[PDB]
């Protein structure tokens, strides 16, 4: 099958309406991939320990947050990961879906590898390189259907496939965490100089050691140029994702109080009846009156989260994740889990930009009703008295354990049986799409890194690597390795299907839509999604869930 | 049937998707109407002659454009007209359709009158008015199925039903043009004082006199409180309306010339090959070279129209209508038929605004490819020489017949076999929807006042009026009329159905959408479509055809 | 006390409500709205902000 | 066009199960609305005296 | 946030903003629901709605 | 008595109505107090604009 | 899933690294002026994102 293609390139997004507002979005994605031989032929147990006593080391006082120490199993295999919005839709698609649909769900996933080509490189004189075809050479493929091997979402480290169809990409090298004891003590710059920082890493433990190899756990297919490989279709079992945001906060839940009379002019206000004589209910029985702020609501929309909370286990210190909610007027970023990420040119960064530094963006939850304005928050002693003297009210300013900047809001946890909140927004195009659930008896109500969590087993990971291309001289009992310089290219097609539903339209007023404009320096300027004079592209994160929706 | 309702109020817009992108938009509209007795009991042949010698009269020199003289047949009947976008959709609907659909067409029309109530007014002392029910009184209804009577689109004079469901409306009084000779001579302020202006109006002519009465031409239904009336369903036969605009002008048609090399940097330009050596075709064979401007295109997109052309017939002088096209960069309003209209509070004007003056708006064609920039236009003598000396090129500045402001562009007609242009845009909410075609052997390719012209016979006009409520003393041989003061209220429900198709999405870049914003003083500020503190509404014209589309 | 209550339209819901013992798992009974029909007088102008109506009221079971 | 009924009836199906059917009827009074249209009303108690929000420590109000 | 003890010079920020595009929702009964007109001889029924809720214990712990 | 704030304004976070104990810590266990009119319970005889008020203490003792 | 109270800590935000003693609460610091009561003693980290294993069975007691 040498001179015949084994597949079809297709990167078009097709919409099929079944009627009644239901839509079958079928996203085809194809890319040309490049795979080079592994630097090492075997599996390595690598360790990373940044315990320098200067700069961003862990030995310098107060540098816990900079910790990067861990151990990993480095494998000669590579992973083909397309789990990221940017791989399947072009900007316009995302816009169209966000502006017209109100619901979206995963349906099925399929992939195939085809048109494999393997080449060898040899030298010449002047020295120039020459490229030849190794027709008989092959490429190894493996598919972990049952997810035996460690799950490693490439989207988390901007290592998925490129978001540009006409540009080539490459698979990310496979590696996974290995257990290793890790202890690091807490210190501050103010902390005494004589104080010694404990920075330790231990030996591999029997109770937690897990070394897996692709060779020993999965069946492997060999692909020569005339071969091709298919995964067959996988069926998703996940919950629908709302494509709208909520705005009603506790202050907007239920029957608004009855105004006494209609405003007298277009600029006037209206007044309610006296607090003392108004009907209603409160949960503070020390005061005989009702007020929008004291009034009993059905439940609590949103909640206070501990920030910037760091916890520690055998592995080391780590920042506890927080539910991405609205950052409010006050713009309390860390308190409401805003997410900031850095990515490469393959995933959005302007191709024109130069320097090692990646592009960075901070994602602020679309929803406006579940965030928390730490500044304006406060707790009043009871029996409650209004107004309260400084000794019967704890607020932002007040300091905990005599620390100027540590306020109660930093360690306050408001989560409770009455807490209700929306689901994290999907992030085009850098966002991860689906995720494997944690194998623990008691699971989390959601994940921060992805909108769709597989209730059952998630689609299996696709692994590839070049077959060792040996030379004429080879000795097994020698650690020395000689291999012919080889590399390969091949195409990848994937088919992701969604089930989506068109939105209803009942408000009298026009609704907020995701648009583009011509105003210079505007975030939504058309010029950002067009090519430059030399073809440089730029794909910034797009808004989503533009349309508002009743919460109650 | 006294104490039982005879109909249902319904003003909701329902979307039914049949699949494949086809949609059945069913717009229900209902209003409460008020009808008072006619000032006169009979038909009158009224004349209007503004021939004053001062102010806005026709006798003052140079005041032709101010002419209002004409004759009309005033009838005691009223017309219920709902032919206007604003009657059927609330703002959001229009937005949703414009942002998601690409095609729209009329399907069917139905209407009914119900819950009729008639009341009489009598006096009292202090004097106050008392209102009583006249159970036995009735209201007259007539439907002109075959359009025998003169067609009178109420949308043209902002006299259709109100665009607000929760607010009452009233039918417009029926009246129609009657033939009357009319002559008015042309003069200018500069024109000699002794010069006498001829302003004449003649006697009714035998060859063109047409006096119709509702009573003699249509069957009339009498409705007492317990009755109701239905039109049955009418089926439209019209062509589809594109919901996209075009941008390609003659300069963007076909194969762009081949650049020599790609730009060297993101700020650089690229160059084509020398005019003298470039391949291509032109229609000017005096010069041996091709250029984007000289290059032969398939046809002519858009064309030059005579403005502000006034023509005259027996009836009088009148401004010749022009095809609504883009007003260009130059913003030549009158040259590209921009439409300006003035409307009342019932049809958009801010309820808060005070003063007799109506609200005014100027509609500029959405399309950007068929307009004409009169300033930059010009004609070159042939054989053509480049560059041309002042004597071989006619441009804007040059004056016709020694008149400083009259340039060739004012009387230039570019229309020809190669002319191509888009259809006038629909205008929400003041725009007319459908229109009766002119009963002439050779018809116009379109109408300026409406997007849908009925190929066959248009829906018939609905007429109403109160039945003369006589008093105890009545004499036929007397011209004197005595009637009991009476008035009535009744509901009107209408059902208009459209067939529309969801738009495709293929561009890489996000597309322009109709949105709303929070920026103060912005034309699209949300605050414009919300009520005021005392309920004052405001409905401004909304954009349409936001999405661009290939022309070739 | 309130008897039943509509659940909050949020992906992650609360384990209960404080204001009511019964929360509808599905969609709650719909709200019933009423109002008097504008009872107009003999003189009426649409283009006017002024409103004149006959004093009216109603009773029903 | 209807029947007034405000009695509570208990129907025992046996095994301790009961079908409580509560009938409720009331005579209602409806007057015309003060305004004929929809209004976007605002309430702002930002007085600097009494139970206003401008006075120090009066958030709860 | 402020307290009575809080310094007098301290200024209390009390603000209310303009209607936002992202969260504005204006609904009208007329535009969203079908409306029935009832004259004296008419009447109106909702038909039966079926609840789907969990049982409520009538005992305390 | 926890107050939190969003774009809308400050508000008292609701709490699960439980027993108020021997100590009678009302606000700490979400006791509910409400004010109502004559149509809903208040003594018809009572006069003055002020409504009748009652504080509900959870029946449960555990 | 365990927790090493000693190595745990909370950093004030906006977060700065490294933090001066006033913008980081750690084990040592005392609550309400009590030498041995540290924040970790009354800190509740439970939340929607919490996941953990099931208690182990204990043979033979
Ligand atoms: Cl798969
Ligand atoms: Cl009809
Ligand atoms: Cl019901
Ligand atoms: Na922050
Ligand atoms: Na003009
Ligand atoms: Na208490």
φ/ψ of residue C22, rounded to 5? -110, 115
Q: Is C6 on the interface with A (CB under 8 A)?
A: yes
Q: Is C18 on the interface with F (CB under 8 A)?
A: yes
Q: Is A395 on the interface with G (CB under 8 A)?
A: no
Residue D60 backbone zone (phi > 0: left; psi -120 to 50: alpha; other: beta)? alpha
Chain D partners of E19 at a C-beta cutoff of 8 Å? 40
Biggest alpha carbon–alpha carbon distance for chain A: 99
Residue D59's Cβ-count burial label (10 Å; 0-12, 13-18, 19+) is: buried
Choose the closest CB to E24 out of B4, B10, B526: B526
Q: Is C33 on the interface with E (CB under 8 A)?
A: yes
Q: Residue B81: which of B340, B338, B519, B463 has the closest Cα?
A: B463
Q: Residue B373: which of B405, B395, B388, B390 has the closest Cα?
A: B395
Chain B partners of A509 at a C-beta cutoff of 8 Å? 91-92, 516, 526, 529-530
Task: Report the C-alpha gap between A419 and G47 in whole angstroms.
Answer: 10
DSSP B423: P
Task: Report the C-alpha gap between A326 and C13 in whole angstroms.
Answer: 17
Contact E39/B9, CB-based, under 8 Å?
Answer: no
Parallel, antiparallel, or unpaired: how do β-strands B339-343 and B359-363 relate? Answer: antiparallel
Beta bridge partners of B490: B33
Chain G CA closest to residue A448: G49
What contacts 24+ positions apart, CB below 8 Å, involve E13-21? E14/D46, E14/D53, E14/D54, E16/D42, E16/D44, E18/B518, E18/B520, E18/B527, E19/B518, E19/B526, E19/B527, E19/B530, E19/D40, E20/B518, E20/B526, E21/A512, E21/B515, E21/B516, E21/B517, E21/B518, E21/B526
Residues for chain F: how many in total? 62
Ligand 6 centre to CA of G12 (Å) is 32
Chain A partners of G12 at a C-beta cutoff of 8 Å? 308, 403, 405-407, 410
Contact D36/B530, CB-based, under 8 Å?
Answer: no
How many domains does chain B contain in total? 1
The number of the ligand nearest the C-alpha atom of A81 reads 1
C60: enclosing H helix or E strand: strand C57-60
Task: Report the C-alpha gap between B222 and E54 in whole angstroms.
Answer: 58
Chains touching chain A, criterion 3+ CB pairs below 8 Å: B, C, D, E, F, G
Query: How big is the CA angle at A268 (ends A255 and C46), to the nearest 5 degrees?
Result: 90
The number of the ligand nearest the C-alpha atom of B80 reads 2
Q: Is C31 on the interface with B (CB under 8 A)?
A: no
- Residue pair B488/B118 in contact (Cβ under 8 Å)? The answer is yes
Instruction: Give the minimum alpha-carbon distance from G15 to chain A in angstroms, rounded to a whole number.
Output: 8
Cα distances from B530 to residues A258, B536, D19, D37, E28, in angstroms, run 20, 9, 48, 12, 11
**Residue B295 CB neighbour total at 10 angstroms:** 18
Biggest alpha carbon–alpha carbon distance for chain B: 99
Residues 342-371 (A) with a CB less than 8 A from some CB of C: none
Chain C partners of D33 at a C-beta cutoff of 8 Å? 35-36
Instruction: Give the minimum alpha-carbon distance from F19 to chain A in angstroms, rounded to a whole number.
Output: 13
Structure determination technique employed = X-ray
Q: Is E13 on the interface with A (CB under 8 A)?
A: no
A214: enclosing H helix or E strand: helix A214-217
Contact D39/B535, CB-based, under 8 Å?
Answer: yes
- Residue pair B493/B9 in contact (Cβ under 8 Å)? The answer is yes
Chain D partners of F10 at a C-beta cutoff of 8 Å? 59-60
The domain of A260 spans 1-552
CA neighbours within 13 Å on the CB side: how many for A520?
0
Q: Is C58 on the interface with D (CB under 8 A)?
A: yes
Residue A544 backbone zone (phi > 0: left; psi -120 to 50: alpha; other: beta)? beta
Which residue ranges of B are tagged as binding site? 146
Q: E–F: how many Cβ contacts below 8 A?
A: 6
- Residue pair A299/C18 in contact (Cβ under 8 Å)? The answer is yes
The number of the ligand nearest the C-alpha atom of A410 reads 4
Chain D partners of C58 at a C-beta cutoff of 8 Å? 29-30
The number of the ligand nearest the C-alpha atom of B83 reads 2
Chain D partners of E3 at a C-beta cutoff of 8 Å? 56-57
> Mind spelling out the 3-state secondary structure of B459-519?
CCEEEEEECCCECCCCCCCCCCCCECCEEEEEEEEEEEEEEEEECCCCCCCCCCCCCCECC
Ligand 2 centre to CA of B230 (Å) is 9
Choose the closest CB to B518 out of E21, E31, E35: E21
Biggest alpha carbon–alpha carbon distance for chain D: 66
Residue F48: asked if its preceding bond is cis (omega within 30°), the reply is: no
Task: Report the C-alpha gap between B397 and D11 in whole angstroms.
Answer: 97
Q: Is E49 on the interface with A (CB under 8 A)?
A: no
Contact D28/C57, CB-based, under 8 Å?
Answer: no
Q: Residue B26: which of B547, B544, B495, B552 has the closest Cα?
A: B495
Contact A19/B19, CB-based, under 8 Å?
Answer: yes
Choose the closest CB to G23 out of A60, A66, A405: A405
Chains touching chain D, criterion 3+ CB pairs below 8 Å: A, B, C, E, F
- Residue pair C12/G48 in contact (Cβ under 8 Å)? The answer is yes
- Residue pair A76/A43 in contact (Cβ under 8 Å)? The answer is yes
Q: Give the CATH number of the domain where residue B369 resides.
A: 2.170.30.10
Q: Is E38 on the interface with A (CB under 8 A)?
A: no
With b meaning 16 or more CB within 10 Å and e meaning fewer, what string describes B216-253? eebeebebbbebbbebeebebebeebbbbbbebbbeeb
Return the beta strands (E) in B90-165 as ranges. 101-123, 129-133, 139-144
Ligand 5 centre to CA of B334 (Å) is 4
Query: How big is the CA angle at B57 (ends B55 and B62), to the nearest 5 degrees?
Result: 90
CB under 8 Å to A364, separation ≥6 — which residues? A326, A327, A333, A338
Q: Is F61 on the interface with E (CB under 8 A)?
A: yes
Cα distances from B119 to residues B76, B254, B543, D32, in angstroms, run 19, 69, 43, 19
Instruction: Give the minimum alpha-carbon distance from F46 to chain C in angstroms, rounded to a whole number.
Output: 22
């Amino acid at each position: 099958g040498i001179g015949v293609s084994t597949g079809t390139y297709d990167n078009q997004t097709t919409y099929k309406f079944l009627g009644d507002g239901w839509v079958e979005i079928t996203a085809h994605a194809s890319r040309l991939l490049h795979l080079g031989m592994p630097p090492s032929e075997n599996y390595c147990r690598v360790t990373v320990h940044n315990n320098q006593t200067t700069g961003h080391g862990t030995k310098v006082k107060g540098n816990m947050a900079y910790d990067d120490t861990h151990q990993q199993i480095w494998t000669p295999w590579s992973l083909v990961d397309a789990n990221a919005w940017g791989v399947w839709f072009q900007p316009s698609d995302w816009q169209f879906i966000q502006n017209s649909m109100e619901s979206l769900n995963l349906d099925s996933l399929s992939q195939e590898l085809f048109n494999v080509v393997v080449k060898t490189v040899t030298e010449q004189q002047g020295a120039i390189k020459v490229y030849n075809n190794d027709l008989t050479a092959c490429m190894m493929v493996a598919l972990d259907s049952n997810n035996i091997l460690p799950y490693t979402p490439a989207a988390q480290t901007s290592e998925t496939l490129g978001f540009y169809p006409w540009k080539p990409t490459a698979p990310a090298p496979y590696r996974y965490y290995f257990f290793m004891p890790r202890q690091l003590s807490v210190t501050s710059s103010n902390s005494a100089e004589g104080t010694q920082i404990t920075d330790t890493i231990g030996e591999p433990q029997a109770l937690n050691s897990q070394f897996f190899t692709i060779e020993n756990t999965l069946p492997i297919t060999l692909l020569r140029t005339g071969d091709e490989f298919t995964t067959g279709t996988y069926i998703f079992n996940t919950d629908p994702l709302k494509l709208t945001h909520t705005w009603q906060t506790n202050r907007h839940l239920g029957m608004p109080p009855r105004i006494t009379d209609l405003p007298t002019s277009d600029t006037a206000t209206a007044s309610l009846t006296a607090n003392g004589d108004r009907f209603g209910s409160t949960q503070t029985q020390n005061v005989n009156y009702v007020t929008e702020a004291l009034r009993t609501r059905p439940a609590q929309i949103g909640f206070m989260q501990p920030h910037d909370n760091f916890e520690a286990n055998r592995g080391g210190p780590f920042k506890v994740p927080v539910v991405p909610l609205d950052i409010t007027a006050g713009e309390d970023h860390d308190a409401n889990g805003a997410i900031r990420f850095n990515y490469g040119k393959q995933h959005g960064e302007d191709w024109a930009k130069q320097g090692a530094a990646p592009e960075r963006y901070t994602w602020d939850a679309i929803d406006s009703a579940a965030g928390r304005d730490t500044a304006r928050c406060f707790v009043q002693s009871a029996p409650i008295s209004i107004p309260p003297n400084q000794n019967q009210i704890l607020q932002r300013e007040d300091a905990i354990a005599g620390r100027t900047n540590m306020h109660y809001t930093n360690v306050f946890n408001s989560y409770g049986p009455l807490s209700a909140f929306p689901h994290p927004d999907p992030i085009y195009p850098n966002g991860q799409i689906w995720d494997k659930e944690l194998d623990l008896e008691h699971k989390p109500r959601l994940h921060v890194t992805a909108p769709f969590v597989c209730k059952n087993n998630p689609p299996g990971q696709l692994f590839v690597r070049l077959g060792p291309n040996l030379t004429d001289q080879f000795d097994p009992n020698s650690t020395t390795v000689s291999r012919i310089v080889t590399y390969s290219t091949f195409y990848w097609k994937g088919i992701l299907k969604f089930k989506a539903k068109l939105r209803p339209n009942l408000t009298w007023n026009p609704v907020y839509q995701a648009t583009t404009d011509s105003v210079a320096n505007s975030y939504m300027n058309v010029k950002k999604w067009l090519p430059s004079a030399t073809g440089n592209m730029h794909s910034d994160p797009l808004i989503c869930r533009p349309v508002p929706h009743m919460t109650y």
